[PDB]
Amino acid sequence: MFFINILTLLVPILIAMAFLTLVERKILGYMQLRKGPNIVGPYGILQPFADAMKLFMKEPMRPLTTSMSLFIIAPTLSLTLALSLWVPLPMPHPLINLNLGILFILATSSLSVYSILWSGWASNSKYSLFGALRAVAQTISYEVTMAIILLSVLLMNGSYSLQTLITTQEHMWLLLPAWPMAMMWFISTLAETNRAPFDLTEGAAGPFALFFMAEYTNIILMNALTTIIFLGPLYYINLPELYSTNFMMEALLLSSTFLWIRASYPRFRYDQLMHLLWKNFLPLTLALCMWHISLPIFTAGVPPYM
Amino acid sequence: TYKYVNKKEQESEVDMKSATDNAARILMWTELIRGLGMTLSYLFREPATINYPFEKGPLSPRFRGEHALRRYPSGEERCIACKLCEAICPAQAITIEAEPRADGSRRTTRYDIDMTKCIYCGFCQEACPVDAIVEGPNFEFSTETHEELLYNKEKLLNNGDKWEAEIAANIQADYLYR
Amino acid sequence: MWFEILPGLAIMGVCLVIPGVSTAYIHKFTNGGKEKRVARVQYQWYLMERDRRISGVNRYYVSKGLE
Amino acid sequence: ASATRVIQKLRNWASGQDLQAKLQLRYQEIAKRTQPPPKLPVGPSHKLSNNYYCTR
Amino acid sequence: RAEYVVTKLDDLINWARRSSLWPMTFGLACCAVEMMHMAAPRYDMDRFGVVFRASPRQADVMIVAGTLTNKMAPALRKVYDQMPEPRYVVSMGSCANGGGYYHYSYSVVRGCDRIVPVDIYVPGCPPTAEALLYGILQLQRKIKREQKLKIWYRR
Amino acid sequence: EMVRKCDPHIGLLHRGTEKLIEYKTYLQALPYFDRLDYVSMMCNEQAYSIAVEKLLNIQPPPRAQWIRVLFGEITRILNHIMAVTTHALDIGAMTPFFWMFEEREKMFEFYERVSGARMHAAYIRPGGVHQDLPLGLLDDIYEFSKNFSLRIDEVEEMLTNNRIWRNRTVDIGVVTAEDALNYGFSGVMLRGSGIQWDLRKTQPYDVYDQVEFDVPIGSRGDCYDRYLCRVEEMRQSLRIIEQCLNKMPPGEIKVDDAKVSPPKRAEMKTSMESLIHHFKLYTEGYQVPPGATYTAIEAPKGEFGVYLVSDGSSRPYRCKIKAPGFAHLAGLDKMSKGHMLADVVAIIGTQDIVFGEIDR
Amino acid sequence: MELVEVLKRGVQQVTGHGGLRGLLRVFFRANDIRIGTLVGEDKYGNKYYEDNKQFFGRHRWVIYTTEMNGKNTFWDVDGSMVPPEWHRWLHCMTDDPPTTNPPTARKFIWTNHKFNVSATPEQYVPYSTTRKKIHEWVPPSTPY
């Protein structure tokens, strides 16, 4: 069987993402010196199912604005990628081995843009057209680092296959050899999935569930995908279930981390952001995706292809 | 005394001792940590929230809220139609048409507040030379209708026939004080 | 207080442990106690499809015992 | 209050200054309600002599 | 049984409805400020599932704080026919109820109710944040009582 | 992409207050001035009383003058907290907002205990002050004020060396000094460009004469040096408080004259004359002389002032309110020239649009 | 130890409210498990616990009871309750509750507080309480 396994991949992340939307409000309260939800249930745990059932009773917003065969796709497309964006992601053994999986992430991660464009082009609003377009060049100039920062790292790894990284992280984490990559990686995780200090879609009305469902979904992923690449947890194959249990807390730290950001800083004024990724990171970055290519050439040895 | 908020720009011969400390304040980010690690303190602090209907907050006995017509300790409605508790009411909120009481005495036939007027300013509780009108600690009297706030007088007695157990202790700590 | 978030975390925190430990055990139930036996390159396939052609079509078994 | 003599060092290390003494909110030793009733002062011109309205 | 259960459903339909509602808190005036003191720690909104700043077009409720001029009114009602149609309404302030001060003035509306319906009126010139926070709960049982399918069954 | 020409539509909250006072007497019109700078109440009342007190020719007593300064620079602390933080919200920072609005609600209670209610405190009347303040109030300001110089620098740890703040804020809305005066900002928005000026020291009126405080001038005109002015003006209340706290004189309130202040409520109730005045104060009122003034006071905004105009009738004759923001906003479309959207948000916060001033 | 002392202190919090029903009730009722010294227990069940150690807005909390004047006050809990002698104690206006210094009977006060009736019957309706201010005419039923 196999259906039984995706049954243990989707519902065990959709529950998770929902309790992020809660923990979001619970931390940031306590960041802001206040309890969050307490009366929806025991300790706010029952907020999301309530908020969920709220939106899915939303009275029929008049479907303006297009042949609605495109207002159907923008949410249904982006959420669809995210649930697929997890599949190769190898908790100790992946659901799906991919020899090029780390590269399968970017496309699926980057193809989601058409949700933000088509909702911007469908939405016959002279402002939101070029209001949901800043956010696209935003997401795109971000995408470069998301590859280079990912690429130059895998230079001193073997193939693109994510199963390798567990082996490469035997005695050591990739956090130390490239702490800069991780820095430029981390913002490149905030970068796409705007839920970050920079938002630029908060300064797509009726089916707000799906963006609200996919946005936070990619968070737990792209935090997780940072752990599995840099903050490598421990595999030690006779009790592989440990790895997942250590894979947990790093994903929660990296995700508790984001929430400390939004309750740390303000937005970023979309001209700096380019200036940040066309003067400061990318020129800094190429030297690193020139450094690691000389690295094994210099050092002694280059990793394999299994 | 005038104080320059921001006057520190002076060419201090920026050397590698210090000029890189700014580069230590940069690429190896520290000021952002400094702004982050602060916030992390508060989540380990005591949130000052309170479970409102079970934990209501602090007031003081001079709180300006809902009105009420007091009464003497021996029946006898304390309001006597002076007609300066509207002449001062800046909202122009009030109409207190009056008559004799059929006892030969002097009282009202009318008394009014539009509580959607009535800024809750406090001129009337103090202008009343008798403390016949007062302004008591109720602030949960929101209703679903603009009409149920137009308190006439029978509500505004039987309200004053309710909190008199309370007002006569706040005012007990507020006479000899205004 | 500071710890009433943990019912948000530890519930989430016993959510993603499942697809790591389960999918381990979902594979090991099928494949017979061993793992999925990944196939990255072609040579990992001949050995497999060879082993497929040794017994009942499942491929996680017969070893020595014959000769 | 219930600060377990560790998180104080986590707060202060994470923030700086010893701030259990200058904490955010208030507990005790403040405004012990129902202070006694005061006999106010009086203003001037309660003097009964050389007190007209012309000189005020 | 049918009618028994639908009653037990409507207690659940109107629960998710009320347990997390998304306002569109206007400013406009002094009255605005108390909501922020109600967004503050002490009388927090977010403890009820009430969100601080939500967009109008996905809102579930309106909260009118302040005076309401004859100029702002179209800009107001334009919003009210852009919410969905569970939209509930809350009129903070003596200036929105009936224009407490400036009832009699000319660039002013003599009550938000003159323009839009009202599910709850709330008094105070500066209604205390709590003094709203009971009212917002009074809204949160104005609809726990109301039954949509219980009567649709009889339709 | 970029802004060149912007135009506000300042009318969306007008009410006719200047008209609506003409049909109401002075005492009957006081709380309208709490509404204008709805964030900072007393300082409006602090001015309105003076415009009366000039005409009536009265200095109120010291103890009432004295407390009129105290709240007169707690209200200073409010609007800074309301436009330091809201200038951070609409720029994006939502946290210090909530850190303060418990610290701010401890600052309303010190109206609620003193005045009737929390916010629209009709506490400062023309004849000094209505009502003395209680016993369990002044031991409380010490604890509060002690813990409060931390809460700011607690924040200044976080923002005033923050990249996301500084380059979002610095070089922004460069105001030329001599051009401000052509526009008459006359509040923070000129001292933040180096025009050394403050009425509290350049035209002192109340007991500010003996306080030993300072004016935080801003050079390098930009909304970060306005910001640092707005911070340090919060701090240098506390030097003023500490000096406005430890030498309060015992004295009188609600000026000795019963024609310009209501009398003691226990004293209207036996002494006849105090009853009649109580019956005519609160119906007819002062009966000012005719005349005219242009008062002023630097609120957090700036030169808040009133051109009250009188007549022998008890009621006024076209009061007028000088909304200091009213000129700051006319300069909105000159200081945002060669700048894009996102900072225009910041421009609003660093012009302090507490609309009610702007609106009438 | 340190940590365990909290749990030697945080465990009676749960096992200090009688049984489990008495505890689990409070939880869904108010989500406030804090051991409190009792001073009140009014008519119709308002308890008014207390603990001076917590901060300034939680040192006094009231637990309403069910069965108000026909309303089933388990879920639907108000603040328009708390009749006019504890309201002044709960909002920290004073220190002394109304057991050692209760209010003074005046032989006309209500004997049972009615809460904020929102839209039910038993609510307010306005009048024109002015005795009609005119007297028109009456025809004589005697034709001509």
Ligand code: SF4
């Ligand atoms: S409320 Fe007071 S002032 Fe007004 S009519 Fe009654 S007794 Fe006179």
Ligand code: SF4
């Ligand atoms: S409190 Fe002020 S506005 Fe309200 S009725 Fe009394 S005098 Fe009028």
Ligand code: SF4
């Ligand atoms: S009701 Fe009072 S506080 Fe509210 S807007 Fe009007 S004047 Fe301001």
